[PDB]
């Protein structure tokens, strides 16, 4: 599962909270195996990271 409620907490690799208190509301769940973006969908990089 994936969601924005995961911010600022700790979960197991399975995806369940282990040390925090409460539960996480995940809107969707995605499969681990996927396909990488192709060259046609890529672009150059120039933005700095200070």
């Amino acid at each position: 599962p994936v969601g924005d409620a995961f911010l600022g907490r700790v979960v197991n690799p399975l995806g369940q909270p282990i040390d925090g208190q409460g539960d996480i509301a995940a809107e969707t769940r995605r499969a681990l195996e996927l396909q990488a973006p192709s060259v046609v969908q890529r672009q150059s990089v120039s933005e700095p990271l200070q």
């Binding site: 979960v11 690799p13 399975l14």
Partner: peptide, 22 residues
């Protein structure tokens, strides 16, 4: 604005082997 994902060495090989993909 940070998140932490933990896989202590006490756990079995599955969690350690799978966490980066998650």
């Amino acid at each position: 604005y940070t998140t932490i994902v933990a896989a202590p060495a006490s756990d079995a090989a599955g969690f350690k082997w799978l966490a980066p993909y998650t």
